[PDB]
Amino acid sequence: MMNPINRNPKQVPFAALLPTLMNQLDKDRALQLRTLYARLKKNEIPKEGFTRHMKDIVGDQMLRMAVSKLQQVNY
């Protein structure tokens, strides 16, 4: 407590999630993700929509694993 250290959580961007996921996805799935991102860029779908849709493509398990590896932090 002599020298308190403040730490804050950090999250990786979706931009870095695409290539990681695309590498773990088949070309057909990767193409779906690619066009899905385009929808996000065009703002035709909400961020929640993007996340939800992404989960439907890679899966919740892959989604949490992808960010876990990118974060590379157990906690």
From Swiss-Prot:
Domain RST: 5-75
Paired cysteines (S-S): none
Tissues in which the UniProt entry reports expression: Expressed in roots, leaves and inflorescences.
Compartment(s): Nucleus
Highest taxon above the source species: Eukaryota
Function in brief: TAFs are components of the transcription factor IID (TFIID) complex that is essential for mediating regulation of RNA polymerase transcription.
Family per record: Belongs to the TAF4 family.
Assembly with partners or alone: Component of the TFIID complex. TFIID is composed of TATA binding protein (TBP) and a number of TBP-associated factors (TAFs) whose MWs range from 14-217 kDa. Can homodimerize. Interacts with TAF5, TAF8, TAF9, TAF10, TAF12, TAF12B, TAF13 TAF14, TAF14B, TAF15 and TAF15B.
Protein's name in the database: Transcription initiation factor TFIID subunit 4b
Organism: Arabidopsis thaliana (Mouse-ear cress)
Taxonomic placement: Eukaryota, Viridiplantae, Streptophyta, Embryophyta, Tracheophyta
Section of the entire sequence shown: 182 to 254 of 852
